[PDB]
């Protein structure tokens, strides 16, 4: 339940991760804090 005045301190981040095989990559998600990720400059 997002409150627009406050901020969520967790971001649900999905990304490509390399698998144990050097051919195939997978898509995996994780949870990070606001203090560990920064937005690079829609999407």
């Amino acid at each position: 339940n997002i409150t627009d005045d406050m901020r969520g301190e967790l971001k649900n981040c999905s990304f490509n991760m390399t698998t144990e095989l050097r051919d195939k990559k997978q898509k995996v998600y994780s949870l990070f804090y606001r203090l560990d990720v920064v937005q690079i400059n829609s999407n």
Partner: protein, 53 residues
Amino acid sequence: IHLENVTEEFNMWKNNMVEQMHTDIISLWDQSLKPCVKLTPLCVTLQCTNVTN
């Protein structure tokens, strides 16, 4: 040199220095691998068929 009129009790099972030789040969086996080549790029999909036979 030979020792006359002496008697010591031995035990190969509670002996030391088989532990030392085991540890040293394991570690010395490991230390001849640090200059060598890791097969990181070879973990890859292998399309395998039978040998020509």
